[PDB]
Write a protein that binds this DNA or RNA. Structure first.
Ligand SMILES: [Mg+2]
Ligand SMILES: [Zn+2]
Lengths: 103, 202, 262, 37, 67
RNA sequence: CCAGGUCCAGACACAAUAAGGAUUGACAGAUUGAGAGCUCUUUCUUGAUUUUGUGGGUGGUGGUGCAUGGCCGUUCUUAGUUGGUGGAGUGAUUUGUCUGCUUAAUUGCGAUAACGAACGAGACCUUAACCUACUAAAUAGUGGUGCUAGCAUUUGCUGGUUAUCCACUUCUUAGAGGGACUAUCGGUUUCAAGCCGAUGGAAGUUUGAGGCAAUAACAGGUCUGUGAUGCCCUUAGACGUUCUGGGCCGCACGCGCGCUACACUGACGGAGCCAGCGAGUCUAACCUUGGCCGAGAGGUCUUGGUAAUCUUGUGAAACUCCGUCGUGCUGGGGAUAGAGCAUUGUAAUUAUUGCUCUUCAACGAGGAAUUCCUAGUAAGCGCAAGUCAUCAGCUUGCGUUG
């Protein structure tokens, strides 16, 4: 009996949604108590870049952009179930973090 | 270690990009297609998906340990925390002759008839094969011959892709009681093939 | 485990040595060659982030004050790895001058330099730039004849690569008095590239040899024509008549026919 | 400094990355920075 | 000027020379009409084609057109 | 970049010397000028590593040229061009590409010795603004219910409580879809594609923006890539190393980008007090809550956050009110300068920066001329992120008023 908080970070939303739906449909199917996938706001990471690498013309600017999404699902499970889900769920693009303590 | 989260992910992306460019420029003649890395709590595993694998592992793993030390020395890692894995062509679970000789040596060592079959099927299945089939025919330390077969995965049995994809090796292990038939058939990935109005009623 | 007094003292002198450029070495740094156990001491001093000046001065102290096996352990654990790091992490893939002076001075003891530096390098990823740099360093430093002979004899038994051919250049241009068995091993290295029609051939029989190998064949046939037998002379003539060069090959056969048997 | 092309000018020092901008402008997509808006 | 592209014009010309009678003056029916008959890869382009077929149903009901 | 002080040259070949001594190091001292060196007296390792002198050039971590392949930076920055077949002409050439009309467009219609077809542009991608309808939450918020605090009590108000429970996403957010297609009407137009005005709409200038191709041109830049490649010496040159000390800010000045002001829609003193884009520390010391000291600058003692959790509700400034000042280079302005106290830096003088007092310089809306701009836009105002060890008057964003 250990409570495990699993937090998922991903820049792509499709693989993150597939991972979260697989986690929810795997957790509900063998009778574990849990919370839903709590949806943090999407971080938008912006940086400014010159339009002029060379010194010709007037100075004007553009912006490069990123999108980062964060979800976290709280679980309650035994140790072997947590270990086998942590072995299964490793996919490229979605980062899986396992938290033991609740403080 | 212990990098802040956006800096951790951007430096991780630089780590993917630097190994991608290093393996693009290094093994250009060994069919380089892509890489993937797996981060375990024990160590870090590099999976080299290069389509000419027999030139990647040379004599007694010399170029494998060479590329392992190239990852080790430049990227500031402890000795033993990186393992570079070979996948595509010279994976030992994709050749039926190697697995037939392997289960030959496993039966000759004195293992079980079932547990060695579990080991060879799991080693073929974890190596990147679509399917496998194990045929053992013999006495099985008894007075009656038994024919008994186990297929795992998805395999084909007829057609022109039979002549293109499967590999079958026939071996005969010599036991203390008699002889036994060793047939290993391995199915590989076909995506790795590089070369008036009317009314009715009832 | 080490005592914590040694740990904090050598962590302190490791924190000192990051920006050393001139002057005298520290006193606790100059007694490590006098120690019976050097290797635990130098690991606490964080070996990877040394300054180039203490790399060269540690090379000077840890070559001029040690034995041969002690210096080869030093160069293989320290200087070879920092040599590799300072080439592949350099941005034009160059070498620093103090590191160049360190790799130059470490061949004052030649056997330790060979068996700690050169021989792991050729088997663990010797590319063009590393071997060009090391062949230049081996071109500068004057070596005795027998260490050149034995390191050349290791280079002959290596599998073929043009970096190994560059090392074979640098050790065959010394014009030293080799033993006759070293000339025999040079002959045996020059046997594995010819084509055998009896049904025993490898990768080196039909591969493309550049101009560098034929210059090496010219060099060996002009210096050591008088230290071969007639059977080896005929086998080298077979090697000439199989894979001779357009512009070097006639010179090699006319200088090989002008040699006397032993 | 920039460990691609020995660039001692045009560095950006954010996040401990020290690439010059003229090497960042073609290696951004391999790192993960893609042009969106 | 908001001159429509030639793909929308040609697709509407084909769907009105061949699939005249079920198209009408209502764009909202024509949207799922061109969903159920035409395989258009995007919602924007099928909205363009459905609005153009709605407009050609608007002027075809007053008289004949060259097509 | 200088003024000086030091190393380390040279691979290789040849000749004398050298073991009955050429000389490499650990030193302890004499040193040594500014600092390290350098050298010689011992205690010692010594042991060819040679010392000195001649010669093509090794060294190309010696570079410029010639051939290739190659990546990045520009342009005809292709936004109307080319080609196939036809016709016309001995040929250069032309028709396609046009009498007309229309469009933002060589975009179309129509007519026709032109008729096909490609890449241009149109188009593909990516963003925004509305969804009280979904599908859903202690790393967000609201409401109800407990326990509890203070006040009038006649019902109430203001709160606490990172779990006392319940409900929800109305606001916050992750999504699936919708929706817009110039919809409808009226003018205009061969009344053909289109354009303009009105209504509805969250959105009706192409609702607004940039990336992506094919093509012909770049002696553009290097790759520390390769080919007995042309050039100059091969080295007493420091293009290699170090050590200190100075700068790049020095000032009749011209030009340019900005800040602060010339004031009373204001300067000063109290009170009211509103944001968002962010960012933040490991094998180190970032963002800092809270408590003490100090006028302050700040110091000090602890704690939280490796982050929607803590800084932070960034209680920001301009602003709002109530008092002081009266048109007086004034209490506007704050240049310059001195003294002291603190902080960062190894080191603050040519004053790094911050605080206290004093000094209170020009400067009474600016000539010829000139910059930018059509709605949350100009302008004023602060804040955050980069340069960061310390400061911005540098740049990019954000928010407030408008
Ligand atoms: Mg023609
Ligand atoms: Zn660069």
């Amino acid at each position: 009996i250990i409570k495990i908080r699993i937090t998922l970070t991903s820049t792509k939303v499709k693989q993150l949604e597939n991972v979260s739906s697989n986690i929810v449909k795997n957790a509900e199917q063998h009778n574990l108590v849990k919370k839903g996938p709590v949806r943090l706001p999407t971080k938008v990471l912006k940086i400014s870049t010159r339009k002029t690498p060379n010194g010709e013309g007037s100075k004007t600017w553009e912006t490069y952009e990123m999108r980062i999404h964060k979800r976290y699902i709280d679980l309650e499970a035994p140790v072997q179930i947590v270990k086998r889900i942590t072995q299964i769920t490793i996919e490229p693009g979605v980062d899986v973090e396992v938290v033991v303590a609740s403080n | 270690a212990l990098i802040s989260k956006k800096r951790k992910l951007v430096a991780d992306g630089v780590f993917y990009a630097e190994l991608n460019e290093f393996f693009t420029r290094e093994l250009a003649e060994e069919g380089y297609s892509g890489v993937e890395v797996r981060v375990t709590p024990t160590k870090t595993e590099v999976i080299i998906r290069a389509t000419r694998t027999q030139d990647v592992l040379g004599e007694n793993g010399r170029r494998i340990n060479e590329l392992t030390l190239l990852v080790q020395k430049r990227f500031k890692y402890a000795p033993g925390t990186i393992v570079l894995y070979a996948e595509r062509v010279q994976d030992r679970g994709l050749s039926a002759v190697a697995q037939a000789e392997s289960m030959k040596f496993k039966l000759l060592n004195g293992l079980a008839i079932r547990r060695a079959a579990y080991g060879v099927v799991r080693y073929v299945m974890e190596s990147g094969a679509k399917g496998c089939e194990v045929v053992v025919s013999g006495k099985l330390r008894a007075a009656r011959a038994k024919a008994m077969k186990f297929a795992d995965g998805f395999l084909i049995h007829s057609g022109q892709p039979v002549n293109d994809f499967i590999d079958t090796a026939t071996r005969h292990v010599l036991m203390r009681q008699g002889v036994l038939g060793i047939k290993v058939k391995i199915m590989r990935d076909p995506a790795k093939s590089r070369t008036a109005p009317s009314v009715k009623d009832y | 485990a080490l005592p914590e007094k040694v740990i904090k003292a050598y962590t302190t002198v490791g924190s000192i040595l990051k920006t050393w450029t001139h002057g005298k070495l520290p006193k606790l740094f100059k007694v490590i060659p006098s120690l019976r156990n050097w290797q635990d001491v130098i690991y606490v001093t964080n070996p990877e982030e040394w300054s180039p000046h203490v790399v060269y001065e540690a090379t000077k102290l840890f070559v001029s004050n040690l034995t041969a096996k002690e210096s080869q352990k030093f160069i293989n654990l320290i200087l070879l790895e920092r040599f590799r790091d300072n080439i592949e992490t350099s941005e034009d893939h160059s070498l620093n001058y103090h590191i160049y002076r360190a790799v130059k001075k470490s061949l004052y003891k030649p056997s330790a330099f060979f068996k700690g530096f050169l021989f792991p390098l050729v088997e663990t990823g010797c590319n063009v730039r590393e071997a060009t740099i090391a062949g230049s360093v081996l071109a500068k430093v004057s070596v005795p004849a027998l260490h050149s002979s034995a390191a050349l004899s290791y280079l002959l038994r290596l599998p073929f690569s043009p970096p190994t051919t560059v090392f074979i250049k640098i050790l065959l241009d010394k014009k030293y008095a080799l033993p006759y068995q070293t000339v025999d091993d040079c002959v045996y290295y020059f046997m594995r590239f010819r084509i055998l029609d009896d049904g025993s051939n490898g990768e080196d029989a039909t591969r493309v040899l550049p101009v560098i190998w034929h210059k090496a064949f010219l060099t060996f046939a002009q210096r050591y024509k008088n230290d071969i037998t007639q059977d080896q002379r005929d086998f080298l003539l077979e090697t000439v008549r199989q894979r001779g060069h357009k512009d070097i090959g006639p010179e090699i056969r006319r200088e090989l026919l002008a040699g006397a048997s032993r | 400094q920039c460990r691609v092309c020995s660039s001692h000018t045009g560095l950006i020092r954010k996040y401990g990355l020290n690439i010059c901008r003229q090497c960042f402008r073609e290696k951004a997509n391999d790192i993960g920075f893609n042009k969106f808006r | 000027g908001r001159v429509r592209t030639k793909t929308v014009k040609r697709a509407s010309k084909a769907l009105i020379e061949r699939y005249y009678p079920k198209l009408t003056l209502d764009f909202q029916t024509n949207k799922r009409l061109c969903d159920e008959i035409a395989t258009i890869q995007s919602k924007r382009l099928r909205n363009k084609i459905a609005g153009y077929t709605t407009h050609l149903m608007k002027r075809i009901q007053k008289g004949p057109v060259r097509g």
